[PDB]
A paper describes a structure:
AG resistance is primarily conferred by three classes of aminoglycoside-modifying enzymes (AMEs): phosphotransferases (APHs), nucleotidylyltransferases (ANTs), and acetyltransferases (AACs). The fold typical of the Antibiotic_NAT family is evident in all structures, composed of 13 α-helices and 8 β-strands, and determined structures superpose with pairwise RMSD’s 0.8–1.0 Å between 197 to 266 matching Cα atoms.
We found that the Group 2 member AAC(3)-Xa, derived from an Actinomycetes, is limited in its AG specificity to the 4,6-disubstituted AGs kanamycin and tobramycin; the only other Group 2 member tested in our host E. coli was AAC(3)-IXa and did not convey any detectable AG resistance. This analysis suggested that gentamicin would not be accommodated due to the Tyr79 and Asp130 residues, which would clash with the 4”-OH group or the methylated 3”-amine of the corresponding AG substrate, respectively. Based on comparative analysis of the AAC(3)-Xa and AAC(3)-IVa•apramycin complex structures, Tyr79 would also introduce a steric clash with this AG in the AAC(3)-Xa active site. Notably, Tyr79, Asp130, Glu220, and adjacent active site residues are highly conserved in Antibiotic_NAT Group 2, suggesting these are critical determinants for restricting the specificity of these enzymes. In contrast, the AAC(3)-Xa enzyme exists as a monomer in solution despite forming a dimer in the crystal lattice.
Residue numbers in the entry:
A (entry chain B): -2 to 283
B (entry chain A): -1 to 283
């Protein structure tokens, strides 16, 4: 029921949530002109947002202003599965012969990231990074250098957009999104040194020189965790949720509300520094 | 989700590729130069390698550069028709702050699925200007089909749907159920019968760079342009009944595209049939 969904969201926020009200709530959280902010969104948690994703994006642009930048994690919803080489031989041949290349302009973001990354990447002037598995998108003053030349291998590591967010003094905003959605902690996993690090190898079709070619990629296991967190994390619990919870308890990050959405704003450099130290201390046992 | 893939892969007995869809579309009767409005239920096709992009590429492969694809978009985040029933403070917030419809960025209705949202993002795609029932089109006839969508009676004469009929266009249901045929709203707008139901609603648009509120009139495309209670059996959707009767009268062809039950109609005889069906069932002189 469409009617119903609207009724519940209106009730949740006690009426429509507007662009200027979101702008006000974001400034109260600590977002300021000139910031670069990567943001994860659970749109319905805000309430009934008058104008949907476009209103959230324009409120964010109002706060950071023309010299600031917004960033999201996109990925590729219709990528071939990592394990597509475990299918009957005629099937995977069909994939290898006919699966289209990743295309930054048209390939849709992963559906699990919700509507906001797919709205951001389609904004006029938005820039989407070239990686077929873990592309980001950005909008604003620093968007070309942040997204430029996404490193094929180790795409969460030293050369990556996430590293550039840290070096810029950027921020991470969870906008109703839960603590485990903080993508930036994959950059922490990529930097962290501890035994038992998990890596993945997969292939995906990309377009280079205007022709479609397959490429093999290496990354940390950003799906099941770059380590076994068995010893440091109660089972049933998500490692990133535990790290961010400890982060917050150590005084890194500010919590508040944007509409009806429980929201958290972090500086990216201390969050990554905390995350790598968390992983190395819990997992090295020296 | 690996089981999700196993379900889809079992449904189509392996990946459905661009070439396989093109093959099945041609066998259903789509030809080079066709203009085709299509409604899609991706999961009914099976495991489509490449998702919506692959469906669109296959359709372009069949109709070629002289052909045109059309979809219905609408506007997912339009103000609800009845926001003017809300408490005064809530409707004043919508009036002062709801952003204008923007054909380049306003999202299609979530219920229309992922194909319309992918089509309108293609390079060269054209999206009509109507804030409530916009269409999008891609190909040689897209500018003329989408141009100057009438504000009032947006399914009536001179609308994109009327232009699809006049062009000799077609309608494709690609695993979509018989009741998503948008073209039959054009039949409802043309049909002469008692008790026709209309809606009047307000939506923000941009006119010469300024955001303005406008009032719009349409047939009730949400609840049905007529009370169909005496014309259809209980629990059946009117458009499904009309399309079923259309098929049984020899209008339209049916087959499979991948695993998806699919139906292809010529738009001019579909609308003529739909108008007659409504006038015969709802006048009963
Ligand atoms: Cl490049």
């Amino acid at each position: 029921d469409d009617k119903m969904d609207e009724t519940e969201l209106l009730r949740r926020s006690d009426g429509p949530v507007t662009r200027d009200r979101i702008r006000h709530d974001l400034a109260a959280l600590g977002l300021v002109p000139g910031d670069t902010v990567m943001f994860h969104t659970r749109l319905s948690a805000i309430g009934y947002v008058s104008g949907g994703p476009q209103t959230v994006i324009d409120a964010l642009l109002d706060v950071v202003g023309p010299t600031g930048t917004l960033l999201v994690t996109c990925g590729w919803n219709d990528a071939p599965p990592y394990d597509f080489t475990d299918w009957p031989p005629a099937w995977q041949e069909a994939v290898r012969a006919h699966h289209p290349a990743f295309d930054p302009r048209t390939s849709e973001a992963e559906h699990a990231n919700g509507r906001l990354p797919e709205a951001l990447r389609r904004r006029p002037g938005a820039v989407r990074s070239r990686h077929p598995d873990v592309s980001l998108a950005a909008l604003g003053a620093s968007a070309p250098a942040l997204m430029d030349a996404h490193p094929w291998d180790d795409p969460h590591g030293p050369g990556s957009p996430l590293a550039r967010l840290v070096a810029l003094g950027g921020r991470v905003l969870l906008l109703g999104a839960p603590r485990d959605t903080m993508t930036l902690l994959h950059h922490a996993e990529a930097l962290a040194q501890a035994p038992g690090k998990r890596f993945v190898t997969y292939e995906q079709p990309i377009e280079v020189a205007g022709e479609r070619v397959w490429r093999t990629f290496r990354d940390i296991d950003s799906e099941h965790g770059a380590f076994d967190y068995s010893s440091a994390v109660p089972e049933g619990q998500d490692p990133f949720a535990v790290i961010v919870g400890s982060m917050l308890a150590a005084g890194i990050g500010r919590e508040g509300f944007v509409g009806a959405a429980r929201s958290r704003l972090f500086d990216a450099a201390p969050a990554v520094e905390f995350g790598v130290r968390w992983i190395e201390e819990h997992l090295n046992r020296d």
